[PDB]
């Protein structure tokens, strides 16, 4: 209670001084709440949905309705803003399911994400997967990049911190995927290339951390994932809205939230 009050007060200070709204949820591996802030306020998911999308793909691999080495053909029509791996593989004419999923998770590659969405039935099928694993909140309505428009008040392409944190825990800890598929996605999250300056920059350097970032128009900056601290496993979701901050200052904001999280966790002994 005392620690939870410091958590709240310190996030409210960041919110007030950075003119930002901060949504956080921390859950244990079974989805029980450790701490939260605006945890049931809706925020645009931005690229954070690419981690659940990968989980959906591995579920189809686990079930035999997809194969990771299946070649997904495409042309230049699939290149959109921020498609670094898709652009590199374009001349070869395809990416495999697994290549696309790894680029979506680790580089946030939009073309690779849309390639997978083409294959699994689109935003509706992403939403259906959320519902299947117990998430009645998260919804994908659009492909990239327009799903990141983050029009104020729009409930399309949103989640809440608590719903997403519980989805992360379900995927990583609650048996949604085989051990092999779970480990593959865990390692992709640890080796993510886009999160060096966000949440994991605010955590102690010996905590094992893996996460997926998101950036939206109108000041969305998010980071979801998992961390292992003091031999305890957690799932975490951070969504922020800071319209007036610079991109670097939003990075710093999420890292600061990581520090506030750390101080709560360390006050469990």
Contacting residues for 114 by C-beta, under 8 A, at least 6 apart: 78, 80, 143, 144
- C-beta neighbour count of 217 within 10 angstroms: 14
Q: What sign has the CA pseudo-torsion 218, 82, 127, 222?
A: negative
Contact between 62 and 176 (Cβ < 8 Å): no
Resolution in A: 1.6
Q: Is 181 annotated as a binding residue?
A: no
Q: Is 215 annotated as a binding residue?
A: yes
* Closest CA relative to residue 41, chosen from 195, 237, 234: 237
SS3 content of the chain, % helix, strand, coil (to 5): 50, 20, 30
Task: Tell me if residue 246 is catalytic.
Answer: no
Query: Catalytic: which of 2, 47, 92, 256?
Result: 47
Show contacts of 86-94: CB within 8 Å, 24+ apart.
86/110, 86/111, 86/112, 86/115, 87/111
Cα distance between residue 142 and residue 79, in whole Å: 16
Structure tokens at 152: 């104020």
Contact between 208 and 227 (Cβ < 8 Å): yes
Name the strand (E) or helix (H) holding 3: helix 2-18
Q: Is 144 annotated as a binding residue?
A: yes
* Domains defined along the chain, listed by start: 2-266 (3.40.710.10)
Structure tokens at 3: 């620690």
- Reported as half-sphere exposure (CB side, CA atoms, 13 A), residue 261 has a value of 35
Please name the method used to determine this structure: X-ray
Contact between 54 and 61 (Cβ < 8 Å): no
Contact between 100 and 115 (Cβ < 8 Å): yes
Contacting residues for 151 by C-beta, under 8 A, at least 6 apart: 218
Contact between 27 and 33 (Cβ < 8 Å): yes
């Amino acid at each position: 209670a005392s620690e939870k009050l410091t958590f709240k007060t310190d996030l409210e200070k960041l919110e007030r001084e950075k003119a930002a709204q901060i949504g956080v949820a921390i859950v244990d591996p079974q989805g029980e709440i450790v701490a939260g802030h605006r945890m049931a306020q809706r925020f645009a998911m931005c690229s954070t949905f690419k981690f659940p999308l990968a989980a959906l793909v591995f579920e189809r691999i686990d079930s035999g309705t997809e194969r990771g080495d299946r070649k997904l053909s495409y042309g230049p029509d699939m290149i959109v803003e921020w498609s670094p791996a898709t652009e590199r593989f374009l001349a070869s004419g395809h990416m495999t399911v697994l290549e696309a999923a790894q680029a979506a998770v680790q580089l946030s590659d939009n073309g690779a994400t849309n390639l997978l969405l083409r294959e699994i039935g689109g935003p509706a099928a992403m939403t259906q997967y959320f519902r299947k694993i117990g998430d009645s909140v998260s919804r994908l309505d659009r492909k990239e990049p327009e799903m990141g428009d983050n029009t104020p008040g729009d409930l399309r392409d949103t989640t809440t911190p608590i719903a997403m944190a519980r989805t992360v825990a379900k995927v990583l800890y609650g048996g949604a995927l085989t051990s092999t598929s779970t480990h593959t996605i865990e390692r992709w999250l640890i080796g993510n290339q886009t999160g060096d300056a966000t949440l994991r920059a605010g955590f102690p350097k010996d905590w094992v951390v893996g996460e997926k970032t998101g950036t939206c128009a109108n000041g969305g900056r998010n980071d979801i994932g998992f961390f292992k601290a003091q031999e305890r496993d957690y799932a975490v979701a951070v969504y922020t809205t800071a319209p007036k901050l610079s991109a670097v200052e939003r990075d710093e904001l999420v890292a600061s939230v990581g520090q506030v999280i750390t101080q709560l966790i360390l006050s469990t002994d």
